[PDB]
Write an enzyme that holds these catalytic residues in place. Sequence first.
Site, mmCIF file in Angstrom:
data_model
loop_
_atom_site.group_PDB
_atom_site.id
_atom_site.type_symbol
_atom_site.label_atom_id
_atom_site.label_comp_id
_atom_site.label_asym_id
_atom_site.label_seq_id
_atom_site.Cartn_x
_atom_site.Cartn_y
_atom_site.Cartn_z
ATOM 1 N N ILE A 178 21.998 64.406 67.004
ATOM 2 C CA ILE A 178 21.658 65.586 67.001
ATOM 3 C C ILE A 178 23.527 66.497 66.829
ATOM 4 O O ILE A 178 23.416 67.212 66.472
ATOM 5 C CB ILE A 178 20.763 66.589 68.174
ATOM 6 C CG1 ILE A 178 20.026 65.330 67.712
ATOM 7 C CG2 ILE A 178 20.723 67.371 68.187
ATOM 8 C CD1 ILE A 178 18.879 65.469 66.244
ATOM 9 N N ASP B 280 33.040 64.452 74.056
ATOM 10 C CA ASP B 280 31.621 63.220 74.418
ATOM 11 C C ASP B 280 32.903 62.296 75.067
ATOM 12 O O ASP B 280 33.265 62.154 74.529
ATOM 13 C CB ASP B 280 31.642 62.700 73.123
ATOM 14 C CG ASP B 280 30.046 61.949 73.243
ATOM 15 O OD1 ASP B 280 30.346 60.862 73.852
ATOM 16 O OD2 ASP B 280 29.232 62.369 72.710
ATOM 17 N N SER C 285 11.627 70.320 71.181
ATOM 18 C CA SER C 285 11.642 69.419 70.380
ATOM 19 C C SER C 285 11.583 69.574 69.356
ATOM 20 O O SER C 285 10.751 70.402 68.265
ATOM 21 C CB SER C 285 10.453 68.468 70.909
ATOM 22 O OG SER C 285 9.097 68.867 70.732
ATOM 23 N N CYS C 286 11.646 68.545 67.786
ATOM 24 C CA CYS C 286 11.775 68.277 66.964
ATOM 25 C C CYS C 286 10.410 68.827 66.021
ATOM 26 O O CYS C 286 9.575 69.344 65.364
ATOM 27 C CB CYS C 286 12.285 66.924 65.772
ATOM 28 S SG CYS C 286 12.406 65.797 66.732
ATOM 29 N N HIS D 141 5.256 58.033 63.562
ATOM 30 C CA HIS D 141 6.449 59.609 64.067
ATOM 31 C C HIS D 141 7.394 58.348 63.707
ATOM 32 O O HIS D 141 7.044 57.425 63.862
ATOM 33 C CB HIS D 141 6.748 59.411 65.256
ATOM 34 C CG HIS D 141 7.525 59.770 65.944
ATOM 35 N ND1 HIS D 141 8.187 61.447 65.703
ATOM 36 C CD2 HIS D 141 8.600 58.871 66.979
ATOM 37 C CE1 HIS D 141 9.216 61.393 66.322
ATOM 38 N NE2 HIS D 141 9.666 59.829 67.211
ATOM 39 N N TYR E 155 15.758 70.303 62.689
ATOM 40 C CA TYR E 155 15.712 70.572 64.209
ATOM 41 C C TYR E 155 16.590 70.953 64.244
ATOM 42 O O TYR E 155 17.320 72.356 64.490
ATOM 43 C CB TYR E 155 15.050 69.460 65.322
ATOM 44 C CG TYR E 155 15.808 69.920 66.624
ATOM 45 C CD1 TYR E 155 14.590 70.842 67.293
ATOM 46 C CD2 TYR E 155 16.626 69.087 67.257
ATOM 47 C CE1 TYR E 155 14.898 70.867 68.396
ATOM 48 C CE2 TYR E 155 16.888 69.478 68.673
ATOM 49 C CZ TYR E 155 16.122 70.781 69.282
ATOM 50 O OH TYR E 155 16.482 70.777 70.196
HETATM 51 C C1 LIG Z 1 13.258 65.138 67.556
HETATM 52 C C2 LIG Z 1 13.631 63.719 67.065
HETATM 53 C C3 LIG Z 1 12.580 62.929 67.880
HETATM 54 O O1 LIG Z 1 11.258 63.151 67.346
HETATM 55 N N1 LIG Z 1 13.367 61.460 68.898
HETATM 56 C C4 LIG Z 1 11.569 60.886 69.662
HETATM 57 C C5 LIG Z 1 11.126 61.581 69.646
HETATM 58 C C6 LIG Z 1 9.795 60.772 70.946
HETATM 59 C C7 LIG Z 1 9.867 59.147 70.601
HETATM 60 C C8 LIG Z 1 8.724 58.976 71.245
HETATM 61 C C9 LIG Z 1 8.589 57.220 71.875
HETATM 62 C C10 LIG Z 1 10.713 58.962 70.222
HETATM 63 C C11 LIG Z 1 12.123 59.406 69.586
HETATM 64 C C12 LIG Z 1 13.824 65.672 68.986
HETATM 65 O O2 LIG Z 1 14.995 65.129 69.104
HETATM 66 O O3 LIG Z 1 13.613 66.221 69.793
HETATM 67 C C13 LIG Z 1 13.672 66.108 71.377
#
Ligand SMILES: *[C@H](CC(=O)Nc1ccc(C#C)cc1)C(=O)OC
Length: 325
Positions: free
Chosen positions: A11, A32, A148-149, A176, A311
């Site tokens: 990100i 970082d 979140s995304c 997902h 996002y």
């Molecule tokens: C969007 C990216 C994303 O969806 N990461 C993610 C979320 C949930 C899980 C599980 C289980 C794995 C990966 C984002 O970063 O929003 C926070």
Amino acid sequence: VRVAINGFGRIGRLVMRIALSRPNVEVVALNDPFITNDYAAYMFKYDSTHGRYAGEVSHDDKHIIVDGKKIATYQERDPANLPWGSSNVDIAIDSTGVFKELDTAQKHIDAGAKKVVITAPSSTAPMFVMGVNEEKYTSDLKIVSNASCTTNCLAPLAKVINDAFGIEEGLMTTVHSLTATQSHKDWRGGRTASGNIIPSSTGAAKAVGKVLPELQGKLTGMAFRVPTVDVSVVDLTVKLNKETTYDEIKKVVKAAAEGKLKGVLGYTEDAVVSSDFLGDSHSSIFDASAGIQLSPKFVKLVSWYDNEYGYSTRVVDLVEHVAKA
Ligand SMILES: *[C@H](CC(=O)Nc1ccc(C#C)cc1)C(=O)OC
């Protein structure tokens, strides 16, 4: 608007790509503690899904350098030590996912930043989704979260649908993707990702209740994680208050995509597949051909999202908005 980025995972790197391209945003610094400047430059230059950065990337002992722009780099475990006041950092963007509450994100304020944007959901900082509730932000809130995304994909479509037809109840599935490696709190998630469909929980459907209070308690759902490119798809099955037809839903979504939600909500009717959305900067792309209506108040709606890129574009959007205030 002068920004600094904390954390250089997926990100933070994509937020930086996008913020370099925004004319009114200047990236001043990066922090970082877990990487060196040469690895940071490598990681920024190469991306298996969003391409090599179209520009020159290098570094020296105190910067990452992108198309000539030098960006100061730091390695602080405690953001309170960062020179944000000295650097004149207007907004600190925290993408570590560990300084995501009001008391911890405060450290960037203590270090001299005017406001903070958390690129992760928050239990304590107010949450904002562009095109959903950003008009509700007021310039006295100094620490905010971009949710979140998946929430960013669901909430704009839910708002459009609720405004036009009313949502009585909705159940959500997200197919997902594996974003990155993100297992003793989630047993299914410790299994090999590569050949499996792996069910999972998600709070995305309930976090819509925070930014759309009128939908509080009216949505829940689940996820199926699959081993595909960083594009995911939301599958929303809603009971509606008012009778409608699918063509009416298409016109309503399409009008919002071309109008007030321009750039946030997208609309297609093409025979698309997930990799067609790699790099797409919308939060939500309604797939008109994939959805299906069973009866006048019962419909399945489908919406795509690049789970990193849309996002990250919204993050820089929220940064500018919070600054415009
Ligand atoms: C969007 C990216 C994303 O969806 N990461 C993610 C979320 C949930 C899980 C599980 C289980 C794995 C990966 C984002 O970063 O929003 C926070």
